[PDB]
Amino acid sequence: GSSGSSGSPINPYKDHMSVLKAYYAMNMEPNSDELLKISIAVGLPQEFVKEWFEQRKVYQYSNSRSGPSSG
């Protein structure tokens, strides 16, 4: 707790990331339809984005407490 933000700045490249985090944050498992667009809005190859989403499952299923992948 004890959290609170007024507003986040804008990133030139990071954008490609934040965006992906914005889609997932709303939906856990996207559909072939979304996946495509997701990689489009950013310009990345749907093939790549796909794996990116799959990985998330690894952590979501694996215990976070224990030394996770990153963070």
UniProtKB/Swiss-Prot annotation:
DNA-binding region: 8-64
Residues annotated with Phosphoserine modification: S8
Protein name per the record: Zinc finger E-box-binding homeobox 2
Subcellular location: Nucleus; Chromosome
Subunit structure, interactors included: Binds activated SMAD1, activated SMAD2 and activated SMAD3; binding with SMAD4 is not detected. Interacts with CBX4 and CTBP1.
Disorder: Mowat-Wilson syndrome: A complex developmental disorder characterized by intellectual disability, delayed motor development, epilepsy, microcephaly and a wide spectrum of clinically heterogeneous features suggestive of neurocristopathies at the cephalic, cardiac, and vagal levels. Affected patients show an easily recognizable facial appearance with deep set eyes and hypertelorism, medially divergent, broad eyebrows, prominent columella, pointed chin and uplifted, notched ear lobes. Some patients manifest Hirschsprung disease.
Organism for this UniProt entry: Homo sapiens
Function: Transcriptional inhibitor that binds to DNA sequence 5'-CACCT-3' in different promoters. Represses transcription of E-cadherin. Represses expression of MEOX2.
Signal peptide as annotated in the record: none
Induction profile: Down-regulated by microRNA-221 (miR-221).
UniProt family annotation: Belongs to the delta-EF1/ZFH-1 C2H2-type zinc-finger family.
